[PDB]
Design a protein around this ligand. Structure first.
Ligand SMILES: *[C@@H]1O[C@H](CO)[C@@H](O[C@@H]2O[C@H](CO)[C@@H](O[C@@H]3O[C@H](CO)[C@@H](O)[C@H](O)[C@@H]3O)[C@H](O)[C@H]2NC(C)=O)[C@H](O)[C@H]1NC(C)=O
Ligand SMILES: *[C@@H]1O[C@H](CO)[C@@H](O[C@@H]2O[C@H](CO)[C@@H](O[C@@H]3O[C@H](CO)[C@@H](O)[C@H](O)[C@@H]3O)[C@H](O)[C@H]2NC(C)=O)[C@H](O)[C@H]1NC(C)=O
Ligand SMILES: *[C@@H]1O[C@H](CO)[C@@H](O[C@@H]2O[C@H](CO)[C@@H](O[C@@H]3O[C@H](CO)[C@@H](O)[C@H](O)[C@@H]3O)[C@H](O)[C@H]2NC(C)=O)[C@H](O)[C@H]1NC(C)=O
Ligand SMILES: CC(=O)N[C@H]1[C@H]([C@H](O)[C@H](O)CO)O[C@@](O)(C(=O)O)C[C@@H]1O
Ligand SMILES: CC(=O)N[C@H]1[C@H]([C@H](O)[C@H](O)CO)O[C@@](O)(C(=O)O)C[C@@H]1O
Ligand SMILES: CC(=O)N[C@H]1[C@H]([C@H](O)[C@H](O)CO)O[C@@](O)(C(=O)O)C[C@@H]1O
Ligand SMILES: *[C@@H]1O[C@H](CO)[C@@H](O)[C@H](O)[C@H]1NC(C)=O
Ligand SMILES: *[C@@H]1O[C@H](CO)[C@@H](O)[C@H](O)[C@H]1NC(C)=O
Ligand SMILES: *[C@@H]1O[C@H](CO)[C@@H](O)[C@H](O)[C@H]1NC(C)=O
Ligand SMILES: *[C@@H]1O[C@H](CO)[C@@H](O)[C@H](O)[C@H]1NC(C)=O
Ligand SMILES: *[C@@H]1O[C@H](CO)[C@@H](O)[C@H](O)[C@H]1NC(C)=O
Ligand SMILES: *[C@@H]1O[C@H](CO)[C@@H](O)[C@H](O)[C@H]1NC(C)=O
Ligand SMILES: *[C@@H]1O[C@H](CO)[C@@H](O)[C@H](O)[C@H]1NC(C)=O
Ligand SMILES: *[C@@H]1O[C@H](CO)[C@@H](O)[C@H](O)[C@H]1NC(C)=O
Ligand SMILES: *[C@@H]1O[C@H](CO)[C@@H](O)[C@H](O)[C@H]1NC(C)=O
Ligand SMILES: *[C@@H]1O[C@H](CO)[C@@H](O)[C@H](O)[C@H]1NC(C)=O
Ligand SMILES: *[C@@H]1O[C@H](CO)[C@@H](O)[C@H](O)[C@H]1NC(C)=O
Ligand SMILES: *[C@@H]1O[C@H](CO)[C@@H](O)[C@H](O)[C@H]1NC(C)=O
Lengths: 328, 175, 328, 175, 328, 175
């Protein structure tokens, strides 16, 4: 096309890649620090310090544990029929009613914490031949002596305590949780003074199961002016089953049932403040964002959260190797 | 990297190349200059984002689990609760540690791969008219003005158009 | 080799690779769907719906749970001395003899389910001073009143229930499982009517361990015309140890021992039909093939089975990328 | 892929190539034709089967384990039984998900590797007698009849036999 | 530079890589044996057979189990106030004092094994109205009859066992472990002969918890000339809490408390010899080196140890593929 | 391997090469010679040791855990203790098995990579003066004495110094 020129000229083309003056060191299969152009952090390691109140229903227990709320300690009566996604228990919560212990407290705190509801329904139990509604000075309902708002302390009427034998069928289509208990007198005198008989007995049964407890007399440490204890127990009654409470002494009767739900509910011990904000992931240290795949804030979590890991930093290279000239 | 282009035959990077990841500096008839290659920059970026999204893929949510803090000493059951959580944590920690290591290793070789792929693509295009200087630079053996450089970079360079010029200028043996 | 020709001719060689018109999308490290020439499914996600009866010894419990079979409910007497690899319990199984509860039922169902055998050996216990072989109308053995074929309800003779105190040494070279129990009368009158004493006691011991239970009187719900319950207990007696049964009331004595085996045996709750076919992997949904590495049918499995996973499809590319000719 | 042959310099595949995975398409004065390369097809296939067998390697059998279904509410122990199985499942699900991802990624790069390996092998063989047209096709600069093509494909092509013919025909600069 | 030569000559350069005549086969993603130039074993699969006594404080229990050491069996009195990182229990250890059982033995072996100390502090309990310091011929302290060096068998004084009711406040800043028990008489006569009352009762409480046990009369197997048993129980008393022991029979009283530590301590059953050497990783089979990442010696380990794995060999290629020219 | 140098175009290894991993055998005016390449031998070794150290990285220590041996039959809790440990072991066994497989696969491709990298580096240096014989050997088309071979190996070979000699000797077509 063109003609043979008497001049000859070349060009130079060089390929290359960028570099930044400031790379990030990242780990690989063969090296423990190799500097790349850029990386992302994959470990969430800091909390807001605040439990966001959205989207899950947080319920702050304030100075009530969930079991006190359940039982109906006077100072916890605020929680009656409450409902939660996450119940938060505070470290400063205290009990302040009759001294009780719950054999397998930890399972009770779990069954109601997962149920998510404290909805109580009163049932008409007729206690024939005993003095209902007893209370104590250790559990003041205002000026007066009182008791747990959901239990019924039964004492002898006149001069006798009959053998109580009552039934309450589960005619509804749902499971019913009944909370009940037994009083352990501090002295053998207290036993007879209260329940007439020298040894009470409580047998709570269903067609599926039975449990009989005998009280145990003896001095325990003074707690709120009392050296006696009551112990709490629970009976789930299935639809179509029947509950038969039977006792000739020391029964702390149930006033009805708690409904049981199945759902995403749980309890968390935390002193972090609830605050108004949206956050899917709750940690005792406050909410954390779940945009990263792993977190190092706390192994206790509730909700859509990153996987807890021991590493506190794990950087994913999002760039080539940094091989700079030097510059500034 | 496995291909030996980045931190290999290409001695070092260009802190000056602020408009793309891979590119072309040239020196010619009009003078010296530089241009980013946007097609391999996108190819490297899309693969890195592909990786990223898959790691950042769905969080699993968990609700009521087991207790992980205890305030009294209980023995056999609590011992187990602690062993289950402890070994769960160690297994997930291993997993996160191996994941970013394989991931990072691959990012360094895939960006190395793209560098070498650009290079080879230019090599193939220039056909008999250029020689590899080794250092990631081709010596183009014919008059190549700024539109000529533009056609190499935009993938339209016709080698026939300058073959006889280049080929003569290339094999004229004399020193 | 030859001399300069006058005609100039070239050839063209092109390398390439196949493509199929129909690729499969597969996942990678950098892409979530990339189309490959071919892939294999790695997640087994369907069952035959039938428990194959080969190679493992399936035993269909039909309407007997394993504990009823063990205890010897009349309607479960078919299972006496049976043996299984997998005992399958059906949802419709029922009990139909004297009302009983088993404290830690779940461990008892496990120890015998893993033992794999119901082989019973009668031992000559001599109960001196009591009426052996009592039964009840709640447990009809045909026309008549009866009881569990492996327990022995002991009642007073005339006006006396002595303190039973018997021994049975483990002279054999194997462990012996003894199943025994205690009757809880519904009334204090039933207690004396049956066992004379106001409170029975059962203490079952070996040189290694002891357990003493006291019955618990009280009305429980009517079940098969009974408001009393018996509770089942178990004692493994090691070779060279001795069993010493000791009671002055409410003992439901053992008629001998069950042999214990150690092996691959287990129990499964399933309503799938047993059928005749070979299959190494049993799932409550029926057998599944274990040719794939992972399955999504059911997390309960018995035998050589794929690892349960949440994914229901996971495709392994077994081919190159599909880049078809007739493009997009 | 890391090598950039498949879906790279080789534009697209041949739906027509039904007898092998990799192959050769040509044009000489005797006509045109196509033939599968069976040696790299076997190489890619054996590696894919090697992968497969190792995944399909021994099932672990388990017999008496723990209960995984419950019909009443029990609290602390059942809470643990459910946590143990739930975290077991999540860990094995992660594992199966990461395994087919690494696996698939590697299958795409090993088949890309074999494509490029075939290409390079042909390149090396043809020596100074052919030029790379870039698109995965070589321009053979000498008379190459069907037995000549057959010798390239079956790996017996002697480049010396046509070197002077090719080399002349190649560097005869004129347009 | 020089002028065109009339001679012409070429050279040959060939690149290559080494090969060894003896490669090692190693596994990959695509092959199950491929021969590489060299590899490293990653599975530690052999023990010295000896528990090195360094750096952890091994305590060889010799013929004492930790619970016998705790309780104070005469033959285990060597261990009083001892301290360990790892307590090693030997298969041949025996007990040789009064027959006892520990309900939840396994948690007791765990709480003290992790505490790491047997430091006992005697407290001044005043038992008013009972005969202290009882012992038995089943527990000879030398020529004479004796008992566990840390328990105190209380028997009625004169002709009366009063109701014991004592307190011991935790005034210190640490938790206190109290070990106590209850005696189950073999006969109803033994009950009255020893404790006067027909049924004893022991109630041990703190403000946090209570436990009441009633003894259970009955013949158990002769063990060291005894058919009675004592059962061991434990009560941790928190700082600022109080212990209140209360009984009218069968109490085996505590002589004070064990201090509780929290630390790296544990117990191991092993018959391997302790020997003098340094080794971070203890296994029942003896120490093993923890230079490799995985081990196959034993799944029980204490200290910095390799992860137990089922594979007994796992070879990491540390070299290229072996492609020898001559080969073999 | 992915590059096809080791056990690929380089037919087999040299059991005789006892001083390095990769190397050069040559033939010239002064006779024949062999020499190890120490720079790629170090490159392959450092990557292999990098891998090794990271695997041999920190042991986790554990102290009081759960019982893993039982001498009596207990049922529900012991069943769980055995299930927790059993599934822990299976998960760590899977992990060790996948780890040495990915690791080994990568070692074979990174040493293959270094072989090919050395080769390519020599290729680039010799520029227009040598031809690839295919088998991993270059035919140097000019008089190359032992110091010339030394400069190729030590990376100082100036191709211009012998370009006209080589280029003539290369394209003098005649058979
Ligand atoms: C069994 O022994 C314990 C310990 O000696 C006895 O417990 C103590 O009983 C007294 C009252 O009888 C309690 O007194 C009260 O203490 C509070 C403290 O602030 C004070 O405000 C009251 O005015 C009164 O003094 C004492 O706290 C309690 N001690 C303990 C450790 O709980 C118990 O009474 C004895 N039981 C029998 C039946 O003898
Ligand atoms: C304690 O209270 C319960 C509830 O009132 C009493 O249980 C009931 O006892 C009667 C017989 O005394 C049972 O009668 C039977 O009813 C069934 C109904 O289908 C029928 O099959 C029988 O033919 C008979 O009529 C009744 O079922 C039973 N109820 C429950 C809920 O079990 C119990 O008797 C009281 N105990 C004492 C000692 O007072
Ligand atoms: C309840 O029944 C058991 C079994 O018949 C009785 O136990 C046995 O009691 C005698 C002593 O009364 C024990 O005798 C001792 O045997 C050992 C064997 O080495 C010997 O060294 C002693 O000198 C003595 O002779 C016998 O071992 C023991 N048997 C068992 C299995 O423990 C028990 O006495 C009965 N209880 C009552 C209150 O009747
Ligand atoms: C139902 C009943 O008896 N309540 C009474 C109790 C109990 O006798 C004791 O709590 C037994 O422990 O004693 C009081 O002195 C109290 O608590 O102040 C008065 C209270 O009305
Ligand atoms: C050994 C014995 O006493 N059996 C009798 C029982 C028991 O007295 C009750 O089951 C106590 O609960 O009562 C019956 O009326 C019954 O079951 O129909 C008759 C039966 O022969
Ligand atoms: C405190 C006390 O009573 N100790 C006596 C015991 C107990 O009566 C029995 O152990 C009850 O089981 O009996 C002895 O015969 C014994 O052990 O040799 C004498 C011993 O001094
Ligand atoms: C580094 O990578 C992250 C994730 O890809 C990205 O958001 C960020 O902008 C990158 N930084 C730069 C300077 O490109
Ligand atoms: C709780 O809910 C039940 C059901 O509607 C209701 O009858 C009851 O009175 C409620 N009690 C309180 C305190 O809200
Ligand atoms: C979270 O809180 C725990 C204790 O509540 C503490 O140990 C941990 O360091 C905290 N982490 C962060 C990131 O706040
Ligand atoms: C490439 O370069 C040529 C010459 O400068 C120019 O005319 C053409 O528009 C460019 N082609 C593309 C596709 O950008
Ligand atoms: C797809 O892959 C599987 C496993 O390698 C194989 O059995 C199947 O035949 C393949 N399909 C085709 C069309 O090659
Ligand atoms: C069960 O097996 C034993 C041992 O051989 C035998 O004596 C017994 O009679 C068998 N009973 C039944 C019902 O098969
Ligand atoms: C298996 O059965 C379970 C319940 O028995 C059910 O939830 C699950 O979906 C079934 N899966 C298949 C593949 O049948
Ligand atoms: C290769 O092709 C040649 C020429 O067509 C033929 O003669 C020879 O047999 C073929 N060689 C092999 C090894 O197939
Ligand atoms: C094999 O590899 C290990 C670890 O790198 C090393 O210590 C050993 O010396 C190597 N063997 C040889 C012959 O190089
Ligand atoms: C155990 O240690 C305590 C605390 O110093 C000491 O008073 C006691 O006497 C010691 N007893 C023995 C046997 O060492
Ligand atoms: C370790 O000892 C256990 C039992 O103590 C035994 O089963 C195992 O095979 C031993 N392993 C080695 C490497 O000694
Ligand atoms: C390379 O070889 C030349 C020629 O033999 C020699 O003079 C020079 O010192 C060597 N260079 C290096 C860097 O070793």
């Amino acid at each position: 096309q063109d003609l043979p020129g008497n001049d000859n000229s070349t060009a130079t083309l060089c390929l290359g890649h960028h570099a930044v003056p400031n790379g990030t060191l990242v780990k690989t299969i063969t090296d423990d620090q190799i500097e790349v152009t850029n990386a992302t952090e994959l470990v969430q390691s800091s909390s807001t310090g605040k439990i966001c109140n959205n989207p899950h229903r947080i319920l702050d227990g304030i100075d009530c544990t969930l079991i006190d709320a359940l039982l109906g300690d006077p100072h916890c009566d605020v929680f009656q029929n409450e409902t939660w996604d996450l119940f938060v228990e505070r470290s400063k919560a205290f009990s302040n009613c009759y001294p009780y212990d719950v054999p397998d407290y930890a399972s009770l705190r779990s069954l109601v914490a997962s149920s998510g509801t404290l909805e109580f329904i009163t049932e008409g139990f007729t206690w024939t031949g005993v003095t209902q509604n007893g209370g104590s000075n250790a559990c003041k309902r205002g000026p007066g002596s009182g008791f747990f708002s959901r239990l019924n302390w039964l004492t002898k009427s006149g001069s006798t305590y009959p053998v109580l034998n009552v039934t309450m069928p589960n005619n509804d289509n749902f499971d019913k949780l009944y909370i009940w208990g037994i009083h352990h007198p501090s002295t053998n005198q207290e036993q007879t003074s209260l329940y007439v008989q020298a040894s009470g007995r409580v047998t709570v049964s269903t067609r599926r199961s039975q449990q009989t407890i005998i009280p145990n007399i003896g001095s325990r440490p003074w707690v709120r002016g009392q050296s006696s204890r009551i112990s709490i127990y629970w009976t789930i009654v299935k639809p179509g089953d029947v509950l038969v409470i039977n006792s000739n002494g020391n029964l702390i009767a149930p006033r009805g049932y708690f409904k049981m739900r199945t759902g995403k509910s749980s309890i968390m011990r935390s002193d972090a403040p609830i605050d108004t904000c949206i956050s899917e992931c709750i940690t005792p240290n406050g909410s954390i964002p779940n945009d990263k795949p792993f977190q190092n804030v706390n192994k206790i979590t509730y909700g859509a959260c990153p996987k807890y890991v021991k590493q506190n930093t794990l950087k994913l290279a999002t760039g080539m190797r940094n091989v700079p000239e030097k510059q500034t | 990297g496995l291909f030996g282009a980045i931190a290999g035959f290409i001695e070092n990077g260009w802190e000056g190349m602020i408009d793309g990841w891979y590119g072309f500096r040239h020196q010619n008839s009009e003078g010296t200059g530089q241009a980013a290659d946007l097609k391999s920059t996108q190819a490297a970026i899309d693969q890195i984002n592909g990786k990223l999204n898959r790691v950042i893929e769905k969080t699993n949510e968990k609700f009521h689990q087991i207790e992980k803090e205890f305030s009294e000493v209980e023995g056999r059951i609590q011992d187990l609760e602690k062993y289950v959580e402890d070994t769960k944590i160690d297994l997930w920690s291993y997993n996160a540690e191996l994941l970013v290591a394989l991931e990072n290793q691959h990012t360094i070789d895939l960006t190395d791969s793209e560098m070498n792929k650009l290079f080879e693509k230019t090599r193939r295009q220039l056909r008999e008219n250029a020689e590899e200087m080794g250092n990631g630079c081709f010596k183009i053996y014919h008059k190549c003005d700024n539109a000529c450089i533009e056609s190499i970079r935009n993938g339209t360079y016709d080698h026939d158009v300058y073959r006889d010029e280049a080929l003569n200028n290339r094999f004229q043996i004399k020193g």
